[PDB]
Design a protein around this motif. Structure first.
Motif, PDB file in Angstrom:
ATOM      1  N   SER A  29      58.027  67.730 -98.856  1.00 59.15           N
ATOM      2  CA  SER A  29      56.829  66.616 -99.380  1.00 59.15           C
ATOM      3  C   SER A  29      56.200  67.386-100.403  1.00 59.15           C
ATOM      4  CB  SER A  29      56.129  66.271 -98.216  1.00 59.15           C
ATOM      5  OG  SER A  29      56.685  65.273 -97.235  1.00 59.15           O
ATOM      6  N   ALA A  30      55.151  66.709-101.103  1.00 57.53           N
ATOM      7  CA  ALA A  30      54.375  67.253-102.058  1.00 57.53           C
ATOM      8  C   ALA A  30      52.846  66.823-102.395  1.00 57.53           C
ATOM      9  CB  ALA A  30      55.166  67.016-103.451  1.00 57.53           C
ATOM     10  N   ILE A  31      52.287  67.765-102.807  1.00 55.44           N
ATOM     11  CA  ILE A  31      50.800  67.139-103.240  1.00 55.44           C
ATOM     12  C   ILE A  31      50.729  67.431-104.768  1.00 55.44           C
ATOM     13  CG2 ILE A  31      48.472  68.061-103.247  1.00 55.44           C
ATOM     14  CD1 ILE A  31      49.134  66.701-100.593  1.00 55.44           C
ATOM     15  N   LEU A  32      50.357  66.432-105.358  1.00 61.20           N
ATOM     16  CA  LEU A  32      50.106  66.447-107.043  1.00 61.20           C
ATOM     17  C   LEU A  32      48.659  67.101-107.136  1.00 61.20           C
ATOM     18  CD1 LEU A  32      52.891  65.178-106.950  1.00 61.20           C
ATOM     19  CD2 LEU A  32      51.651  63.124-108.261  1.00 61.20           C
ATOM     20  N   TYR A  33      48.684  67.997-107.804  1.00 65.27           N
ATOM     21  CA  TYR A  33      47.254  68.573-107.942  1.00 65.27           C
ATOM     22  C   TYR A  33      46.868  68.492-109.163  1.00 65.27           C
ATOM     23  CZ  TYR A  33      43.433  71.525-106.813  1.00 65.27           C
ATOM     24  OH  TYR A  33      41.878  71.921-106.498  1.00 65.27           O
ATOM     25  N   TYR A  34      45.764  68.132-109.397  1.00 67.10           N
ATOM     26  CA  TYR A  34      44.738  67.971-110.665  1.00 67.10           C
ATOM     27  C   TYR A  34      43.600  68.898-110.496  1.00 67.10           C
ATOM     28  CZ  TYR A  34      47.477  63.580-110.375  1.00 67.10           C
ATOM     29  OH  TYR A  34      48.672  63.120-110.137  1.00 67.10           O
ATOM     30  N   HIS A  35      43.810  70.002-111.625  1.00 69.26           N
ATOM     31  CA  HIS A  35      42.653  71.029-111.931  1.00 69.26           C
ATOM     32  C   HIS A  35      41.411  70.589-112.077  1.00 69.26           C
ATOM     33  CE1 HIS A  35      42.516  70.988-116.124  1.00 69.26           C
ATOM     34  NE2 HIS A  35      43.777  70.834-116.300  1.00 69.26           N
ATOM     35  N   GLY A  36      40.369  71.285-111.882  1.00 71.52           N
ATOM     36  CA  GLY A  36      38.986  70.974-112.380  1.00 71.52           C
ATOM     37  C   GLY A  36      38.580  71.746-113.584  1.00 71.52           C
ATOM     38  N   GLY A  37      37.572  71.877-114.093  1.00 71.31           N
ATOM     39  CA  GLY A  37      37.008  72.401-115.433  1.00 71.31           C
ATOM     40  C   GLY A  37      36.434  71.349-116.213  1.00 71.31           C
ATOM     41  N   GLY A  38      35.670  70.401-115.527  1.00 67.68           N
ATOM     42  CA  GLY A  38      34.718  69.648-116.087  1.00 67.68           C
ATOM     43  C   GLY A  38      35.249  68.503-117.285  1.00 67.68           C
ATOM     44  N   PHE A  39      36.764  68.341-117.038  1.00 66.55           N
ATOM     45  CA  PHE A  39      37.311  67.610-118.043  1.00 66.55           C
ATOM     46  C   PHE A  39      37.458  68.397-119.382  1.00 66.55           C
ATOM     47  CE2 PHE A  39      36.056  63.992-115.064  1.00 66.55           C
ATOM     48  CZ  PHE A  39      37.160  63.802-114.527  1.00 66.55           C
ATOM     49  N   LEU A  40      37.013  69.514-119.208  1.00 62.13           N
ATOM     50  CA  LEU A  40      37.012  70.397-120.600  1.00 62.13           C
ATOM     51  C   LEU A  40      37.970  71.489-120.677  1.00 62.13           C
ATOM     52  CD1 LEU A  40      34.461  70.618-123.242  1.00 62.13           C
ATOM     53  CD2 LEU A  40      34.907  72.753-122.334  1.00 62.13           C
ATOM     54  N   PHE A  41      38.056  72.129-119.530  1.00 59.16           N
ATOM     55  CA  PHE A  41      38.885  73.251-119.473  1.00 59.16           C
ATOM     56  C   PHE A  41      39.893  73.478-118.132  1.00 59.16           C
ATOM     57  CE2 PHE A  41      34.624  74.548-117.623  1.00 59.16           C
ATOM     58  CZ  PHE A  41      34.859  75.254-116.615  1.00 59.16           C
TER      59      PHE A  41
END
Lengths: 300, 300, 300, 299
Positions: free
Chosen positions: A73-85
């Motif tokens: 199984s998996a998790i899709l990870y979306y990084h942070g950084g304020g939508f800028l970095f």
């Protein structure tokens, strides 16, 4: 107040950097990504790592898969950084740590960044990438379930995409793992005003990131605008005691439970914004991340 | 939960009246107005009461002036009621109390009510009436200064009209006295989520009142959306401890001070929304109203 | 956090003095009292001021009576200072202001200070002076009623003496006016831990004062240990938002109202410990003190 | 905004009213039988062994749970206000801790109030830690030993660590504290705001406090301690809607100020007893799993 002393340095690094609302955004992204890669630890070793190209309508995103357990199984990870970095490279040690501690596949996705790409681009990247992978499971070697996760701006995307899945009656993620998402148009809650300066993420930086990502209150930008929280995926919410974004997140947990969605929410005592990606710097933060990663598989 | 026991009957009355969002707008207005008319104590005696017609561009408002002290100065008072209900009759006992305790003229203005009249109708009524009386101050026997005040929705009008005076560089009120204004688009602060059920004003009723006033985040609807708080009139802010509207109000008074505007804010311990107009049922509330009314004349 | 910026100088000055917990008490008293007299402002004019000796059993106390209004009624005022410092002279500007704003006699009493005089000496001084003046009221020109009041350690004495009047069924004061009293044995509440070092009243100093005052459960030392709050005098309670002593005070108001004693409690938004005696440097603090002082005559 | 999973428990507790006049042995009986009556299916565990810990002047029962032929152990002091609880009523929960942590859990029966007042339970906790630390091989223990508890048992765990440090004796590897009572509190904001309606009431707190005390000592109340340095690494779990919350969050802040490793989490929507409610609240269950899954890292 009583912020964890592990943060003393970062709270200094923050102050002596001065004001940055005035330096070119592309310039700013570069600096911040370079900082993040600097005093970093040995990446934990992961059996298989595989790079992917997520070919969407009219754009292609990089994705890196981290796998230490030949995971079903998996998790899709979306990084942070304020939508800028942020980007795969700056998140690489953290996604490794997540993969090692969870023993599931972690797929780290580079959505499009502001201010070059404004809302709804990164939103549409997260939602479209989830459905791309959900249809192309075998390409990624996924035999079981897929959930979604993120931190900060990326946790906003994770929460938002789940609302859209629910609204369209589409395939749903198995779990949403949210490390301190932005969720609401908030310049007035008590956590916002109390912790609006000096705790790394400032009131001014929230407005600036907000101005860069938005053009000109929709539920896919701000999930706390939704009218209905029923039938969303089971959630894990992590909030930080000393973080402007805290109060709306704790309200979100409460709204999910009111709507009959399975949800566990924990506030980290003495933590600040960015705690999870500070796992190499704060032992308390590292244990919070280990706690969450170790229960993730039970949802998959 | 340690709400002042003087509120217990009112809280019960309120729970046993059922789900109020259920009933049609004009019907609810009448029932709420008649409920307050019943709660009425013996009216405080005032030396001079006079009725006026405020003749504005395209509508005429009733106004009633209370003067116990042949006063040189005046406060224009905008009643609360969520933009839906309240009028000069239901506010009469409270306005007499304000005039008796402050020793200044109190002019209670009937603005236009939602849903029949939506934003910006009440707002323009407040701002135009301030300027009408300021321009025609000799008609009201005013030789000194004029400030503005309100409770709940009416204190939203007071704070918002001050923003418009400042923006336009017009004559400014001398002081703004804000009893628990609505200020922000809030369905997510801690005070909002913690106190949105058993404390007379509910979260559900807040949403119902908001949808009735609005058409369709601009600063004259929600002052906390403003860019800039400098050069606003000195403020007195009163919040209640057990009120969903509390946290944005406390933020507001901190943003005034941050901008260098003179402001004093007090939170009434154990109080609930509506406390000031509940001065006949709670002695705690009566003393908070007395405290504020007795310092008004120093600003005038 | 959002401390009113009027206090930034005092916070800095407090920081500059360093840790005074290893200073000998008599030296610290000299430092703090003389520092205060050296830096004070212009005193407010009062019509009559008179010095008295209060000849109690075994000891005589100094008292100063301030009366701007040939008043019938009086408040006995017990100054703050941790039980260790303060005196009539350091409080004189403040007592004058209370007299001017209330219009009643204010009698500032010099109780015995620790560690030279440990508990129960100040407490017995407070209780005995109330009863002495109440018996001899005609000698002080008091024809009407007598209340009691204080700040900080002095407000502890005011609250405690009321409890002993209640217990003994003796004459009780007409009102207890409590500005931010010490009330409980507290090194662990959330206001204590969050606000106990930002320099002005620190955790370490609270301990230093309590150890100097205690000889080693007694409700007359800590009123919050009383098991019954019935039949106490009507109370006014002022707490400060950013003050380690705040949470026990706000509990005390609630306990009073639970026992059916008339009480009004207000928390000053943005205020710190010592706010009332800071009336010359913060307009917000000045307005809170004026609010209280102007309702005092209603109780007398 | 209490998690709706606790609706029933709150209602049932409101129904019962003030039970101060019930004889303490009967209150113990009733609360213990009430726990047993509501047990779910027990989690199966590979090895469970009963022991007697023969101390000076008394013998304690202890029950060891081991699902993983483990080298290290946690000594677990149950909750119950110092008045109730025992190995049987804690058996489903200690099974779950042993399944989720994969280390040995040794649940110890200390002496109960008011028959046995302070410092009896405290001495039982401190003496049983030292007994087993000295006699590790008799319990199949080759590695390290930490200590844990909930509510009153988490007080004993915190307090025994303070005495180990004070006497410069052997120290536990970690102290795992589920919402301990720590301070003489009838006045904090969590105390007064959550004093009724949240299962554990302010009146119960005073009642248990009066039964335990012989009527401000740090091994009674660890928040009275002088100094927090050189204590074992801690995991502190607090509940949002619990009158005991604020002193606990203060304790974690004091440990960190002293340079002790500590991680503290507040469970959003949770109430006192949340960990032993793991069969009725999934959020509570997930909090206990989070904590149990990190425990082996300290051992």
């Amino acid at each position: 107040n009583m912020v964890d002393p592990d943060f003393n340095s970062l709270i200094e690094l923050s102050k002596s950097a001065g004001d940055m609302t005035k330096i070119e955004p592309a310039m700013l992204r570069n600096f911040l990504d370079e900082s993040s890669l600097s005093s970093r630890g040995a990446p934990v070793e992961i059996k298989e790592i595989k790079d992917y190209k997520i070919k969407l309508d009219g754009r292609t995103l990089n994705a890196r898969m981290y796998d230490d357990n030949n995971a079903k199984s998996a998790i899709l990870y979306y990084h942070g950084g304020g939508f800028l970095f942020g980007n795969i490279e700056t998140y690489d040690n953290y996604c490794r740590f997540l993969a090692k501690e969870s023993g599931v596949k972690i797929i780290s996705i580079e959505y499009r960044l502001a201010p070059e790409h404004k809302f709804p681009d990164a939103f549409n990247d997260a939602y479209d990438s989830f459905h791309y992978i959900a249809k192309k499971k075998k390409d990624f070697g996924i035999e079981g379930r897929i959930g979604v996760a993120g931190d900060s701006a990326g946790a906003n995307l994770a929460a938002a995409l789940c609302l859209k899945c629910r609204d369209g009656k589409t395939e749903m993620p198995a779990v949403q793992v949210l490390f301190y998402p932005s969720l609401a148009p908030d310049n007035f809650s008590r956590s916002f005003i109390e912790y609006s300066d000096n705790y790394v993420l400032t009131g001014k930086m929230i407005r600036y990131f907000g101005n860069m990502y938005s053009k000109n209150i929709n539920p896919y930008f701000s999930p706390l605008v939704a009218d209905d929280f029923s039938n969303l995926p089971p959630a894990i919410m992590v909030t930080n005691e000393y973080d402007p974004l805290r109060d709306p997140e704790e309200t979100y947990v409460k709204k999910l439970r009111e709507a009959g969605v399975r949800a566990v929410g924990i506030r980290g005592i003495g933590m600040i914004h960015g705690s999870a990606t500070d796992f190499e710097v704060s032992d308390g933060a590292r244990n919070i991340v280990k706690m969450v990663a170790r229960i993730i598989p039970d949802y998959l």
